[PDB]
Amino acid sequence: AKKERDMDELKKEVSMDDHKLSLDELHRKYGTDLSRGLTPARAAEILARDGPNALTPPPTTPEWVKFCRQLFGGFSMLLWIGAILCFLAYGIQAATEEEPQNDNLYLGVVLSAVVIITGCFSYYQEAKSSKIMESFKNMVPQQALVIRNGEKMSINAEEVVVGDLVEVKGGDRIPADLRIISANGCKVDNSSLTGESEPQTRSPDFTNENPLETRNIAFFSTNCVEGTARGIVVYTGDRTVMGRIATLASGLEGGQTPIAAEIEHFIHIITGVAVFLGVSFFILSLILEYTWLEAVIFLIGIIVANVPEGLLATVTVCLTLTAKRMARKNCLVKNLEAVETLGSTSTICSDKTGTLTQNRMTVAHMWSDNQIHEADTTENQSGVSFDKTSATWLALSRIAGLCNRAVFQANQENLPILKRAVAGDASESALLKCIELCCGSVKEMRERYTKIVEIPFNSTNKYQLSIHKNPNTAEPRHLLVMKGAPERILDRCSSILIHGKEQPLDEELKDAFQNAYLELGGLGERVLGFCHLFLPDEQFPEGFQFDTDDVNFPLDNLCFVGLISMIDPPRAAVPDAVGKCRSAGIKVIMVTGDHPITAKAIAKGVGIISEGNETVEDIAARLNIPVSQVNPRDAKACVVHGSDLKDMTSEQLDDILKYHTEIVFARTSPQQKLIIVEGCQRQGAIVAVTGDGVNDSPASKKADIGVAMGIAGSDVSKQAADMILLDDNFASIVTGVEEGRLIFDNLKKSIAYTLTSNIPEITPFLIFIIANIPLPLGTVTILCIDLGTDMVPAISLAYEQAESDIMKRQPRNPKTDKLVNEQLISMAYGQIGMIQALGGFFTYFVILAENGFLPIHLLGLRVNWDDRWINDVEDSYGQQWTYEQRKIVEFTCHTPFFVTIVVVQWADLVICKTRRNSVFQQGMKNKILIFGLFEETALAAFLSYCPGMGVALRMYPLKPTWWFCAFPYSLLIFVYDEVRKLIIRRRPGGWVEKETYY
Amino acid sequence: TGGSWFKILLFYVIFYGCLAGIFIGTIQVMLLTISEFKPTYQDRVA
Amino acid sequence: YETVRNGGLIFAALAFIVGLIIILSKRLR
Ligand SMILES: [Mg+2]
Ligand SMILES: [Rb+]
Ligand SMILES: [Rb+]
Ligand SMILES: [Rb+]
Structure with a gap:
């Protein structure tokens, strides 16, 4: 209990963690049997010492001092x-x-x-505005499965002391911050921290960006999405990572x-x-x-x-x-x-994912017929299709459809094909959906070609295939299809489509292919390789026995049908609505925890960046970084990785911040979004911040005016914001x-x-x-x-x-x-x-x-x-x-x-x-x-x-x-x-x- | 506090200048009708 | 004043009655 430049200013730092230590060291540090658990006696002996695992709202309930x-x-x-x-x-x-x-x-x-x-x-000019910690403390789970003196028992999260091990199944909220000592197929959703939604995995060992990015730590707010794990509470409540925040984005x-x-x-x-x-x-x-x-x-x-x-x-x-x-x-x-x-x-700060982009993997392009294609990357709008004529796509269509484990939940009568409920995962559902804008319903197409055998999605060995039976009683009676890494797939075929024909693979197209690839990768979207094969009859009579997880039918000399790229597209409006704010001399900046590549490619996508990337001219000329590059700052914009913002001083930021219109810092810890906002503010300006996820909370406060995102937002992000776009129309x-x-x-x-x-x-x-x-x-x-x-x-x-x-x-x-x-x-x-x-x-x-x-x-x-x-x-x-x-x-x-x-x-x-x-x-x-x-x-x-x-x-x-x-x-x-x-x-x-x- | 902080004042008295005679006149021609020495209006003892 | 008594107020009702009869009439525009 000291001053404020400490009680609410001790977040200008982030690290300070021990999870990059031997289980022996760990065990010793907390003095806890890594499998028998912890002693119940010892349990309370710690709770009555450390204090319940839970957050405490700020001391406030005055309904006068404000009236008066x-x-x-x-x-x-x-x-x-x-x-x-x-x-x-x-x-x-x-x-x-x-x-x-x-x-x-x-x-x-x-x-x-x-x-x-x-x-x-x-008075009515400042209605009772508060309640953040409210939702935060309402994000911790009620129960918790932890192991102690032998058995596994369940109790009130509050009762979890530092030191014991807890088990987490898929679909539960992580009790406290913990260093997993063991797991099996564990994947946690870090949204509320990274701001990104795709599931991460948990390994008992590992190391990396020492604390937030290592696969051996689970975080307070987050939750397990599949698999299982056991770890050891390294931090409890108010002292966790989300606690520091929960506190900060509140006090x-x-x-x-x-x-x-x-x-x-x-x-x-x-x-x-x-x-x-x-x-x-x-x-x-x-x-x-x-x-x-x-x-x-x-x-x-x-x-x-x-x-x-x-x-x-x-x-x-x-x-x-x-x-x-x-x-x-x-x-x-x-x-x-x-x-x-x-x-x-004067300035706007935006969360890329969820705010600018709609946060939903969507098929951006396609490489059917040696030619590129683009699609309605929007929320069902203009642009309309890519073609849908050439028989080639026809094929590619089914592939993406059959070679898929996706579906929908309730009856979903609402026509929002794109706003409907997925099952599998981004990458895949992205495809399923894409095949609903057109080509009727996949569910029926899935039953059209019945599946007899399927080789599980990428199993380290890249690719995924399955053989279904073709009903077109004329050509082959067995159609197998597979997709996987674009490189792999391609380099295991021998012939590729063209309007319908089947000219052989060679040097000529292997080029336009690489082009399409790198040429698509550049836009920063993920690309998959699709291909199929019709197993000859005199080779496979009906009823033929295919051996599942065992070699048995062709894999090479297959037919390469095409490429498909998906991404997290910009909202309908976002595109120019950004330009308008520029029309109005307003400066913008992208404050995102997502990764560089994406952040930049997306920045360029929504005007946030035009022409003059720093690190690019570095190559587009005097092949270097320092030299005739850096100093010259011949670059109007740049991309700042959080890893580096961590080692910068007040003025250092000032320079970078107000010496060019980069408009984009990537991979940033919550604190950083704010420290960023502050820096904008410290230069006598009026900054606004637009967010969605909880990782914004802070910046959605130090910010003069905060704009939530209605639906695309956390039942907290909003609680912290001033304005609540309820149509998400940016x-x-x-x-x-x-x-x-x-x-x-x-x-x-x-x-x-x-x-x-x-x-x-x-x-x-x-x-x-x-x-x-x-x-x-x-x-x-x-x-x-x-x-x-x-x-x-x-x-x-x-x-x-x-x-x-x-x-x-x-x-x-x-x-x-x-x-x-x-x-x-x-x-x-x-x-x-x-x-x-x-x-x-x-x-x-x-x-x-x-x-x-x-x-x-x-x-x-x-x-x-x-x-x-x-x-x-x-x-x-x-x-x-x-x-x-x-x-x-x-x-x-x-x-x-x-x-x-x-x-x-x-x-x-x-x-x-x-x-x-x-x-x-x-x-x-x-x-x-x-x-x-x-x-x-x-x-x-x-x-x-x-x-x-x-x-x-x-x-x-x-x-x-x-x-x-x-x-x-x-x-x-x-x-x-x-x-x-x-x-x-x-x-x-x-x-x-x-x-x-x- | 202002370059030639003076002009602002100058074209400020002229204002009360004209704004004044204007009060004068509206008050002059106001009287040019009062009456002949002063009329008198509806008020009586009771 | 046997004039502006029950007559100076009706005058105070020619631009008031345009408040819940004509200003309230910008919707049917
Ligand atoms: Mg977000
Ligand atoms: Rb007054
Ligand atoms: Rb605020
Ligand atoms: Rb007044």
């Missing part, structure tokens, strides 16, 4: 310091808290609830979601002026020239007139939408903010980077506006001090614009569509190009915020003018204990026009000002609708906005004539003009920025205007 975020949440600080300060107002009262009983106390509880509610949105934390970290840099700037004035006036004004209760009522105002009550709660919605928008196209989202990170994304990454980039913009617009109206809300109280000209705008009135009026329009902005070929610009850097900034503030606080100001300030006067205008008068403290005693401009305003002297601002002015703000907010909510295009040669079809712009303007009126609540609010203004006042202004607005946009344009590079573009 608002206690800093957004602007809830000032709100709290405000609604507490304005909760004091109702206190500092004397002669029976008069009307101030209604006000203050209420504005305190109101601003009070606000904070609370402004939190639920500053590790990502951090700040870009978009969500932008919800910071501005929350500060706004909260910067939040006091620069806020307190400034409390001081530079409240100079004992106003009563305490005055300053404070003035304090709690600017507060309210500053924190955009309705805004964060807005972005929340702006997110919620672009989420509930992508989900209709699948690629579900578990964490909102992610949505706008996928757009800020193109959604693009239909996600776009939709994300959209909301970045469609948020500024949505935000700029949502606060420009902040100005028209402060100024009143500010002037309200410089020249005691009666509260133009009311506090209880402010909480009714950002949190009541501009609501739907802020939201609306979000729906606003594009503005250009977005996927044409480099990823938005994250250190410079921010969200909120001068460009914005200047153009929304110091420009329009002002013009709006006048407007509603102007209306303030007219609202008094046509009643008792003091364009030169006014400027005076309007007490209320006096009652009548004074007035202005030929009047007697008192108890009658005192209750009333304010009815010109309360029920009025505030109201007309109020409406005027709305009224200016129209042209705002249209000048911010676009960021660079005249609403003219630009869609003005935001159905939502529009029907809201009215749903706003209207509420306004209902809130201005609402027969009752108008008490706790304003009053009946003179419809004919108590509205149009600001109207003269809304225009200038619209007219103003409209020119600049057109200004920004005529002069593209722009000057002061584009310099203060936005």
